Paper text:
Heat-shock protein (Hsp) 100 protein complexes are critical cell stress responders that solubilize and unfold toxic protein aggregates and amyloids, thereby enhancing thermal and chemical tolerances. They are members of the conserved family of AAA+ molecular machines that form dynamic hexameric-ring structures and undergo ATP hydrolysis-driven translocation of polypeptide substrates through a central channel. To better elucidate the Hsp100 disaggregation mechanism we determined cryo-EM structures of the ClpB hyperactive variant, K476C, bound to the model substrate, casein. We focused on this variant because of its robust ATPase and disaggregase activity in order to capture active states of translocation.
Following 3D classification two distinct structures (Pre and Post states) are identified and refined to 3.4, and 3.7 Å, respectively. The angular distribution of the particles show top and side-view preferred orientations, and the 2D projections of the map exhibit well-defined features that match the averages. The protomers (P1–P6) adopt a right-handed spiral configuration similar to previously described structures, and polypeptide density is identified to span the 80 Å length of NBD1 and NBD2 that comprise the translocation channel. In the ClpBK476C:casein structure five protomers directly contact the substrate, which is positioned slightly off center to the channel axis and closer to the back protomers (P2–P5), opposite to the seam interface. The more flexible seam protomer, P6, which is adjacent to the highest (P5) and lowest (P1) contact positions is asymmetric and disconnected from the substrate, with the NBD1 and NBD2 pore loops positioned ~4–5 Å away. Similar to previous structures, the NBD1 and NBD2 of the substrate-bound protomers, P3–P5, are bound to ATPγS and in an active configuration in both the Pre and Post states. Notably, the P1-NBD1 is bound to ATPγS and in an active state in the Pre-state conformation, but bound to ADP and inactive in the Post state. Conversely, the P1-NBD2 appears to be bound to ADP and inactive in both the Pre and Post states. Additionally, the P6 NBDs, which do not contact substrate, are both identified to be inactive in the Pre and Post states. Finally, the NBD2 for protomer P2 likely shifts from ATP- to ADP-bound between the Pre and Post states. In side views of the reference-free 2D projection averages the NBD1 and NBD2 rings adopt a non-parallel configuration identified by an increase in the distance between the rings on one side versus the other. This asymmetry is identified in both Pre and Post-state hexamer models, in which the overall length of the NBD1–NBD2 double ring increases at the P6–P1 seam interface compared to the P3 and P4 protomers across the hexamer, going from ~75 to 106 Å in the Pre-state and ~77 to 96 Å in the Post-state.
Numbering used by the authors:
A (entry chain C): 161 to 408, 525 to 857
B (entry chain D): 290 to 408, 525 to 857
C (entry chain B): 194 to 386
The structure:
C-alpha cells in the first residue's frame, strides 16, 4: 500500500498541496459519490487543465481542515501510482499480487481510505501480459462492491478512448463533470493561489495582473483550459520578472498587467503588450510606411492601417477578425502589393502571410484544403492549409488573392471566419481567426472603376447603383466584410513613383553584384512615358523596366562592356535607354 | 511463456460437467474473449440477462430500498423510488436500468446524509424532489425542482433575451416558449427541447439569438455546440458530425456533434447557415430532430432529446424584407415556408418544431442596437481606462449612417468601427486622448471626433 | 524552465531551425555562467527514449527504468534539466498491451514541476503526436523556434565557420558565408534556413 500510494492527506498536512478555491459543487458531488453504499467511485472528467486533480487535492485539504462531512472526517486520500504498481512486475502474477496487496491493505483500513487514481485510464489494461485484462478487471469486483472509494481523474477524451471501451468498468465510476471555470471564477482561483507563486518567485503579483491573466488568456489562448492557461501567465510573468531581478533603477519587482501581456504576446504572437514605446510611433506613420511600397490607394492604405490601429488601441471587436477587407480594383493597381506591404509592416517579412491563391478554388470541393478532409478520408491527419497556418500563428494576415476566381460558395466557409473569427478543421479543431486581417483582393468592377473613377468621387465609386442588378452578386458575405475598398487606376504621377520603387529594387539587385547604377531624370521620364498603360496598372512599367533597362544591362554585364567599380549611367541618347560607363 | 492458461485447463472439466461453472461476462466481453475461443464458447450455455423494465426496476429498488436506507440512515420514499427508475431511464443513456436507478437512489441518500451532518430542509428523507437534484447534477439536464430563483429568471426569459436581441419578438417568444415547455415538464420526451429554423434576412439577429439563448441558460455565448454548416458543403462532410466508420482514420476521435452532446446532453446546437450544407447533411439531422437519436460511427446512439437544435438560415431574405411591411407574420411565415420547401425536403421541414421568420430591422431597432454595440465599446474602453460619453446628436448619426435596411445591423457595427473607433484609435495611439478625463463624442455638424 | 508549476519548455519549430541547438546552447549558457542564479550549476541531461524502450521486453521493464529515471531525477533536488530530443517519441513509448506509455508516467511529474523537461519536436510532429494527447500537450509550454532571417543566419554561420574550417582543413570566406545564407534562402525550398 505505502509502496504504491502517495498520501495526499499527509501532503495536505504538510502544506504541500496548493490551495483550492471554488469547486464547492464538484467537491460536494465527489463527496456524495464517495459516501455512497455501493459503487462509491467518483470520476472527475473534464478538459485537460480545468481542475480535476485539484479537486482531489482540495478534497484532501478538506478532510484535513474538517470542512467535510462526518464519515469523511479522518479519511486518507492515497494517490495510487500505477506506474509503481507495474514497475518490477516481470514475472507472472507479480503485478496481480501487487494489486491484491493494495486491495487487501485497503480492506484493512475499514473503508477509511479514499483512493485516488490520477489518470484513471492508465488502469485500463495495466497488467495485461497473458490475455484478458488485469487491472480494471482485478479492481472491478472491489469497485462495484464499494470497497475502494476510488476517485478517478481522467480527461473527457481519455475516458471515451480507454474507459468507455470497457463498459463494465465505465459502469463502476460516477462521472463528476468538472467544467472549465469562468473568467470570473478563475480570477478567484488566481487570487487564492497567487501567494504560492509570489513565494516561489519572490515577486509580487498585483491584482491587475490577476484580472489580466484570466481575461487575456481566455481571449487569446485557444488550445488551453481556464485555470491552467491563466496560471502559466502569472507563473511565467513572475518567472520572467525574477530572471530580470536575479540576472540582468534597473530592477522591477511587481508582476503587473503589462508583464502578463508581455508573456502572452511571446506565447501567442498576438501583440497585446503595450503602446507607449517607439513602436507606438510606427503605427502613427503606418500610412507613411505603407506608402513606401504602395503609391496611391489612399482610401486603401488608410483603411488597412485604421484596422491595425483599431486593434492595437484595444478597440477592435473581439468576436471578429482584426480587419476584413475586400480590395476591389483594376489590374496592377496595388491590391496584392498592399497585402504584401501590410505583412511587411506587421511581420517585417514579405512572405510572412497566409496567402491563399483563391484561383485554385474554382471547384467547390477545393474548399477542403482550407479546412482538411473529414474523419475517415485521405489527408485528414494533415488538417487544412488555412486552419493550421492560423492555429500556429494566430496573428496573421490572410490574403485571399483573386476571390472572384473562386467557386461562388467557397466564401460560405468564410462566413464564420469573418463574422465570428472561427473555422473548424475536419479534425474538429476550431481555429480562432479573431486576430487575423483577412484581406480579399478582387478585380470586380475593374471595367467599372477604370471607366468611372474620373467621373465619380470615392463615395460614389463604392456604390453608384440604385436599381442595377449586381454591384456585387454575393448576398450576405458582403455585409460581414467590414470595409470594402475600391482601388483606383494608377495615373502617370503614380507610375512615376512606382518607376522609382521598381528601380530601387533593381539597384539592390546590382549592388549585390558590385554594379552601381545611375538613372537620369530623362530615362526615368522615358520609363514613365512608355511604362504607362492605364488599363494594365503598373505591370507594363515593370515590363518597361525589364525590357528597356534590364535587357541591355544583362547583355552588357555578360559581354563585359559594363564592369563593376565604375558607375553605370542610364541616360537617353536617341529615344532609348542605353547604359554607358 | 508457454504454460497452460485457465481456459484450456477447465476445458476438459467444463465439458464433462464436473465443474458447475457460472460465468457473468458482458455481451461485449463474451464476444471478444470467449466467443473467439470457439471450443470454450461451446462449453457455456449463455443465459441472457435483459435490462429490466422501469416497472421491474421499481420492484428492484423497493426491495433493496432498506439496504440503502440502513447504510445512509435516511428513509427513501416510494415517490423517490418511482422517480429514480423513471428519471434515470429517460435522462441517463449510457447506463443500464437497475444500476442507474440505484445510483440515483444511493447518491440522493448520500446527499441527504451530507445535509444532516455537513451544514425542514435538515431531514433524513429522500423525496422525488431530490432524486432529480442528483440527476440534474449527474447529467446537467435541469430536471430539478426550480423553486423561485430560476422560476423568476425564465418568467422574464423574453426580456432577458431582448437585452441582447432587440426586435424579433416572434423569435424570442419562440425560443423562450420551448425552454418553458421543457422546464415545466411539458416537452415531448422523444423529440429535442426545441427545433428551430431561424430564417430571415442578413444581419438581423438570428445567430445573435442563439448566442443570447446560450448565454441565457449557460452564461456564455460559446457554450453551445456551434456547427457552421458551410463546412458541410460536401456530401462526405457528415463524417464530421457522426465520425468515421470502423476501419477509418479518426474513428476513435468520434463525431463533433455526437461527441459534444454525449458529453453534455443539455446543450444548444447551432447549425449556422444550414442551407449552405449539402442536402444530404440534413438526412443526418432527420433522426436528430424527430425522436432525437443521432448515432456515432462507433454505433453509440446519442440522445439529442434534451438539446435545443437551432438551424439558422438565409432563405426568405429576398422575400422577407420585400414583403414584411405589407404582410402579417402569419402570411409571411406562410410565404417563406414556400421558399424553404424548395430547399429542404418535406421530411425535414416537418421535423422542425418552429420555423421562425426574422424580420428586417427598422430604424428604431437599429437605434437600439446602437445602444448595445456602443455599450460593448464602453466596456471595451474601461478595460483600457477611458470613459466615453456619446452625444444624442452622435447617436442619431450612427443610427442613420448605420441604417441600411438590406444588410441588417451589421452596417451599424460597421459605422461604429469606422466613425467611432477608427478615429478614436488614432487618438488613443497618438496620446492626445488621455485616460481619466471623460471622453465626449459630439458632432460638429457632420462629424467631430472625441474631445477630451 | 524557472517557473513553479509545469516548467517544461519546448523548442517547437521546423526541421533545421535550431531546436536541438538551443538546448545545446542552453547547456553552454549554464557552464559559462550566462544563465540566471536559478540555473547556475544545473545539469542538462538528454534522455533518449530509444535506450529506455530497448530491452524492456518483460512486463514492467520500461516502467521500472522510467520510474528509475524519475526516482533518480528526484535525488538531484531539482538540479537536472531533462531534455527529450524528439519529444513526440515519448507519447506512446513503452506502449505494451494496454499499459500507459512514457507520456502517462511523466504526466504527474511534468505538471508538478518535478521534471524540468525540454522538448524538441517539430511543428507537425507535435501536431500529430503530442497535440492528440491533450493532457500531455498541456504540460508543455510551446517555445516557438522561428526560422531565422538571412541576416541572422550569416551571424549563425560566422560563429560556425571556425568549426567547419577545422573539420575540413579549408578556409571559409565571409563572402562564402553571406552567399550560403542568401542563396540557399532563395533557391533551396525544402529545408529551413
Ligand atoms: N479550483 C482551483 N483552485 C485552485 N487551483 C486550481 C483550481 N483548479 C485548478 N487549479 C490549478 O490549475 C492547474 C490545473 O492543473 P490540474 O488541475 O492539476 O490538472 P488537471 O485539472 O488534472 O487536468 P489534467 O487532465 O490532469 S492535465 C493546477 O496548477 C492547479 O493547481
Ligand atoms: N500602387 C502600387 N504601388 C507600388 N507598386 C505597385 C503598385 N501597383 C502595382 N505595383 C507593382 O506592380 C506589381 C503588380 O501589382 P499587384 O498589386 O501585385 O497586382 P494587383 O494590383 O494586386 O491586381 P491583380 O492583377 O488583380 S492581383 C506589384 O508587385 C508591384 O511591384
Ligand atoms: N436584433 C439584433 N439585436 C441586437 N444585435 C443585433 C441584432 N441583429 C444583429 N445584431 C448584431 O449584428 C451582428 C450580426 O447579426 P447576426 O445575427 O449574427 O447575423 P445573422 O442574423 O446570422 O444573419 P446572417 O444570415 O448570418 S448574415 C450580431 O453579432 C449582433 O452584434
Ligand atoms: N542559433 C544557432 N546558432 C548556431 N548554430 C545553429 C543555430 N541554429 C541551428 N544551428 C545549427 O544548424 C543546424 C541545425 O540543426 P539542429 O538544430 O540540430 O536541428 P533541429 O532544429 O533540432 O531540427 P530537427 O531536425 O527536428 S532535430 C545544426 O548544425 C546546428 O548546429
Amino acid at each position: 500500500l505505502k509502496k504504491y500510494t502517495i498520501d495526499l492527506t499527509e501532503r495536505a498536512e504538510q502544506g504541500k498541496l496548493d490551495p483550492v478555491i471554488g469547486r464547492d459543487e464538484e467537491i460536494r458531488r465527489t463527496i456524495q459519490v464517495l459516501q455512497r453504499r455501493t459503487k462509491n467511485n467518483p470520476v472527475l472528467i473534464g478538459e485537460p487543465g480545468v481542475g480535476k486533480t485539484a479537486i482531489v487535492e482540495g478534497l484532501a485539504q478538506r478532510i484535513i481542515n474538517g470542512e467535510v462531512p462526518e464519515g469523511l472526517k479522518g479519511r486518507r486520500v492515497l494517490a495510487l501510482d500505477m506506474g509503481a504498481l507495474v514497475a518490477g512486475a516481470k514475472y507472472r502474477g507479480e503485478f496481480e499480487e501487487r494489486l491484491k496487496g493494495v486491495l487487501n491493505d485497503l480492506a484493512k483500513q475499514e473503508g477509511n481510505v479514499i483512493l485516488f487514481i490520477d489518470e484513471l485510464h492508465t488502469m485500463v489494461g495495466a497488467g495485461k501480459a497473458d490475455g484478458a485484462m488485469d487491472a480494471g478487471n482485478m479492481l472491478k469486483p472491489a469497485l462495484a462492491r464499494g470497497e475502494l472509494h476510488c476517485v478517478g481523474a481522467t480527461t473527457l477524451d481519455e475516458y471515451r478512448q480507454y474507459i468507455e471501451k470497457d463498459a463494465a468498468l465505465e459502469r463502476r465510476f460516477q462521472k463528476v463533470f468538472v467544467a472549465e471555470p469562468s473568467v470570473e471564477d478563475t480570477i478567484a482561483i488566481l487570487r487564492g493561489l497567487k501567494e504560492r507563486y509570489e513565494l516561489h518567485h519572490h515577486v509580487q503579483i498585483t491584482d491587475p495582473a490577476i484580472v489580466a491573466a484570466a481575461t487575456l488568456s481566455h481571449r487569446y489562448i485557444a488550445d488551453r483550459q481556464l485555470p491552467d492557461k491563466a496560471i502559466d501567465l502569472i507563473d511565467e510573468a513572475a518567472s520572467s520578472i525574477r530572471m530580470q531581478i536575479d540576472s540582468k533603477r534597473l530592477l522591477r519587482n511587481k508582476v503587473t498587467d503589462a508583464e502578463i501581456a508581455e508573456v502572452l504576446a511571446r506565447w501567442t504572437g498576438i501583440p497585446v503588450s503595450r503602446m507607449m514605446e517607439s513602436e507606438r510611433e510606427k503605427l502613427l506613420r503606418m500610412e507613411q510606411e505603407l506608402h513606401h511600397r504602395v503609391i496611391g490607394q489612399n482610401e486603401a492604405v488608410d483603411a488597412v492601417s485604421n484596422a491595425i490601429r483599431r486593434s492595437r488601441a484595444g478597440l477592435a471587436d473581439p468576436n471578429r477578425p482584426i480587419g476584413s477587407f475586400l480590395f476591389l480594383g483594376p489590374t496592377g493597381v496595388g491590391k496584392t502589393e498592399l497585402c504584401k506591404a501590410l505583412a511587411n509592416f506587421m511581420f517585417d517579412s514579405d512572405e510572412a502571410m497566409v496567402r491563399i491563391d483563391m484561383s485554385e478554388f474554382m471547384e467547390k470541393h477545393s474548399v477542403s484544403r482550407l479546412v482538411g478532409a473529414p474523419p475517415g478520408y485521405v489527408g485528414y491527419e494533415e488538417g487544412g492549409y488555412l486552419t493550421e497556418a492560423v492555429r500556429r500563428r494566430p496573428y496573421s494576415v490572410i490574403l485571399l488573392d483573386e476571390v472572384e476566381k473562386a467557386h461562388p460558395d467557397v466564401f460560405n466557409i468564410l462566413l464564420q471566419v469573418l463574422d465570428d473569427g472561427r473555422l473548424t478543421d475536419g479534425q474538429g479543431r476550431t481555429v480562432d481567426f479573431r486576430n487575423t486581417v483577412v484581406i480579399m483582393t478582387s478585380n470586380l468592377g475593374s471595367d467599372l472603376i477604370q471607366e468611372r473613377f474620373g467621373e465619380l468621387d470615392y463615395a460614389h465609386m463604392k456604390e453608384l447603383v440604385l436599381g442595377v442588378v449586381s454591384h456585387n452578386f454575393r448576398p450576405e458575405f458582403i455585409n460581414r466584410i467590414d470595409e470594402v475598398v475600391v482601388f483606383h487606376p494608377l495615373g502617370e504621377q503614380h507610375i512615376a513613383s512606382i518607376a522609382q520603387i521598381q528601380l530601387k529594387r533593381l539597384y539592390k539587385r546590382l549592388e549585390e553584384r558590385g554594379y552601381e547604377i545611375h538613372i537620369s531624370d530623362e530615362a526615368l521620364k522615358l520609363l514613365s512615358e512608355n511604362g504607362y498603360d492605364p488599363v494594365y496598372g503598373a505591370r507594363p512599367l515593370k515590363r518597361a523596366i525589364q525590357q528597356q533597362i534590364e535587357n541591355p544591362l544583362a547583355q552588357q554585364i555578360l559581354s563585359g562592356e559594363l564592369v563593376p567599380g565604375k558607375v553605370i549611367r542610364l541616360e537617353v541618347n536617341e529615344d532609348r535607354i542605353v547604359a554607358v560607363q
